[PDB]
Homo-oligomer: 251 residues x 4
């Protein structure tokens, strides 16, 4: 054999059967990887986590909770076993209060709202790396989820700003990760119908030279496993676009 | 006079090395009439603003203060007279606490420090536009100061993250500003010796400041096909006046690089 | 006080009064520039066209594929502006791509000899013109070429997109050379403007699917642009070029300035 | 076996330091069945490909030769057997004449020289795709080799122009390829000690060859967060295989950087 055989990976961000994190975890387990999972609030997740092909420890983690971050390493070590380390970490987390999304006016988002958004969606990437790098093996891999923010657009609003920030953060985490011989990258996915796309939240399939199925997250999850594997060992601080090639075509 | 008869708000003056100070000087030399906004040290800023070619009303603006922002348009209108609107708004403002800069470990900057830096350095760009667009004339221009953050670097640390946010915020302000027939652009400048450079960047670099900066300067001058002088703010001031003018009317949500062309060169 | 007062500037690419180069020339003259014009193939028609300009400028023949034209250009420009005088500005406003590499013609069916001719006229000629004219340019000078944002693929523009990609690369290298003379080099990436090349080169290769082909791009570009876009008005592009020809962007080189209403910074 | 049972054309082998050689090697290690193409000195090339892990047919291919291109697909099919198709195609080829490289002045390259360089190095990507697409399986992958040309630099000169053309060509190739259910992508690789590096690049650098190559070897390593080893083609080769695999099913017309992460860092 499996692409991720014998690799110990932490996956965050599972909230539904539809969550990009869930399909990441599923594909990872298929490829031999042994996992540890984190959730937020509805610990509802161990049931959805129960749908996975193999059992994995479900640790609670709130990226706004400095205590959670401080203990996360030790609570992971206790799950995978002492003297064992992580080869992979997946950041699949975002949030933006309704005020900075959709049809709400861009100028009407209070900074407290935005700050919370950027906190959970961008800064948390730096902090998860801080907590986990001390227990990661050389050759290891950190991966975050992203939506191409290099052009403005309707609806995405302040999440676009947060992702922009995340991209910048990613390049700095890479500076730090390199000291451990660990890589850091983002997978910039196209739209997938998840709890976040409908809850908070044609043209893409047209631009994509190979098309795009907004119903299927497997192609995104495969791309994530790719980065977590040993087959992209010269790529860091970077972004891989799993968007059907859409971002490379004007029309 | 490149800016004859334009009424323009210039924020960000703190010393006479401030990029905003040179934007102000040049704009006045080119016939503009200014409203200036300082933060915190108003008595000292007044003395500094008194040394510009012409007099200009100075108003107080803390971009973290929600009440300063609510009264800004009214205060400006009072300063430029009833009936008169702005044609230009220069945003030349930044901050990031020491923890988020220099040789202080990237992972050690607490989010309260980062958030504040991003509030002042990025979100406030949307804040200013929100407060001043109601009082802008069609054909107007909003300009902010950038430092190319598309690649990571030493020392700039979290301010790099805030600049990336700023570019994104700029593109959305463009959309909003478009409803007023107003443009919104950033000028990404190369390194310039300002108070920020001395107090925030150098002070965070500590014992590594001399080497780190000399290699910043040498490498920037070498990469720039037409060279680069950290002591001279005028070429950047000139570029901002270009965007304020009517000579770049089809450009918005964009970034103009006033950096000697260093970002177009690998070495 | 004209933006370009007392500047001597070479402008290529005028073929009609719809040419981007025509509006550039017109606006440059209105701002006090003394112009020298260069034209291709149909000199007589161009001569009558430049007669519509504010002032009568000298017109010199330049086929960018002709070595003899390039080798003798500086000498002829010098004769035009008077000896001892130098140019402050050079405008490259020149493009060509044969029919096989445009429109609905299959991308794979364009022969290399056709592509290479397009790359020669549209991209390499930027370096050729710089080579010839740099020795007759003053410091603080400015070389500007017209671009069309090729960073993503699109229908119809096909191989001209490749040529533009090559041009952006050439520009960054021309900057290095130009820097030795105190001269800046930049591209203006303009949005779609109704020119001869628009109708004949691009319109002709689109067959019947052109009218709306072009009419649907005039609306699409305008929708994306936060400040709008008028594809029948070249003035905002010509003003932008004159801005780079002036002293007001003295720290910008090897670079690309987008006069496209901001469309390229917006997704939908 | 990441490429178990895959049929892949690998062009560009000339010596056992060629990026193509290592691409082929690793592809064979992962169970791929290969067809190789070489140019000019084919008896010499066959002796190099003899050093690969397994036996692969060698086909002559000058990408400037119309007859070679017109027969390619048939010759491939003859090699892999009637009714079988390619799942992969590697374009690992480039050339630029001396006048267009090194310390020879940029302005002195005749167009005929640049054009030859662009034909072999950029146009040939489209012509290879044109010949091989009709015999590619869905789920297939075409990969070409890139060196990040987004900024200008010493020495690389017109090859940089050629690489910029390539990336543009790649984005159009993806459009055509997509009709066949095939991806097309470039791998931008950091510097690797190969024949072209020494004979063409080093060749045109004259007395400055050593210094530029020493700087490249160490400066690229410092910039790359994970380090860079200019003497190991393996990570680049692994990256190419990753694109030939089914593990990047949603990426096309794109560029993947196998460069140590250097292009994301300014210093
Ligand atoms: N759905 C898409 O189309 C799409 C496209 C591009 C990028 N992305 C990105 O992919 C990632 C995953 O989201 P998704 O698309 O799978 O839908 P989702 O609803 O499953 O994503 C939300 C996740 O964030 C977690 N989370 C929220 N606040 C948290 C906190 N304070 N601490 C810890 N975890 C917290 C949630 O519990 C949840 O599992 C995000 O970063 C998202 O923006 C999604
Ligand atoms: N110095 C350079 O090399 C350089 C290069 C590129 C971009 N910039 C940018 O240009 C702008 C101005 O910086 P500078 O170089 O002129 O140094 P500076 O110190 O002269 O100006 C920085 C400004 O931010 C203002 N400020 C800080 N907090 C504020 C608040 N809460 N409310 C209102 N104003 C506040 C300061 O008072 C000051 O006037 C910044 O955005 C900076 O990042 C500087
Ligand atoms: N019209 C648009 O939408 C648009 C948008 C962005 C950029 N551009 C660019 O602006 C420039 C001018 O194009 P235009 O839109 O003004 O149409 P145009 O037809 O008026 O200008 C084209 C010019 O190219 C010149 N030319 C062709 N072959 C030549 C040769 N061998 N030697 C010397 N000159 C030669 C022609 O003589 C002509 O004057 C080009 O570089 C073009 O790609 C056009
Ligand atoms: N060596 C590096 O540092 C580096 C870095 C990034 C990308 N690249 C790229 O990788 C690819 C291979 O280059 P390399 O570094 O392995 O050097 P190399 O000398 O080992 O390979 C160059 C190949 O081009 C082939 N070629 C030249 N003309 C041809 C023609 N007319 N028809 C068919 N093949 C022809 C040669 O025969 C040779 O095998 C190129 O696209 C190159 O630019 C090299
Ligand atoms: C029109 C914009 C296109 C929408 C595509 C998209 C859907 C869902 C996403 O996930 C989130 C979004 C907002 C907040 C938190 C999360 Cl996890 C996402 O990042 C992007
Ligand atoms: C090391 C590279 C340094 C780059 C040069 C530079 C100096 C000062 C700047 O201003 C600030 C910096 C940080 C916080 C607040 C301000 Cl105003 C700036 O944006 C860029
Ligand atoms: C589709 C987008 C249409 C916009 C456009 C129109 C005309 C142009 O001029 C040329 C184009 C092709 C060949 C030669 C010339 Cl001069 C151009 O560069 C761009
Ligand atoms: C500056 C040095 C950059 C590193 C580098 C070395 C060799 C390369 O291969 C070629 C280069 C020129 C002509 C033909 C070939 Cl194959 C290449 O693309 C990049």
């Amino acid at each position: 054999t499996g692409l991720l055989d014998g690799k110990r990976i932490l996956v965050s961000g599972i909230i539904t059967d539809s969550s990009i994190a869930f399909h990441i975890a599923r594909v990872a387990q298929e490829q031999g990887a042994q996992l540890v999972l984190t959730g937020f609030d509805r610990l509802l997740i161990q049931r959805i986590t129960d749908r996975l092909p193999a059992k994995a420890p479900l640790l609670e983690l709130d990226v706004q909770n400095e205590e959670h971050l401080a203990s996360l390493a030790g609570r992971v070590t206790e799950a995978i076993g002492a003297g064992n380390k992580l080869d992979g970490v997946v950041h699949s987390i975002g949030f933006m209060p309704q005020t900075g999304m959709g049809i709400n006016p861009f100028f009407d988002a209070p900074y407290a709202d935005v700050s919370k958004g950027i906190h959970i969606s961008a800064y948390s990437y730096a902090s998860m790396a801080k907590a986990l790098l001390p227990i990661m093996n050389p050759g290891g891999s950190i991966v975050g989820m992203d939506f191409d923010p290099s052009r403005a657009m309707p609806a995405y609003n302040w999440m676009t700003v947060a992702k922009s920030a995340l991209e910048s953060v990613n390049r700095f985490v890479a500076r730090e990760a390199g000291k451990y011989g660990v890589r850091s990258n983002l997978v910039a996915a196209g739209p997938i119908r998840t709890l976040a796309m409908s809850a908070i939240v044609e043209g893409w399939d047209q631009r994509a030279p190979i098309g795009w199925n907004m119903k299927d997250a497997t192609p995104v999850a495969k791309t994530v496993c790719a980065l977590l594997s040993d087959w992209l060992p010269a790529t860091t601080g970077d972004i891989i676009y799993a968007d059907g090639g859409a971002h490379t075509q004007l029309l």
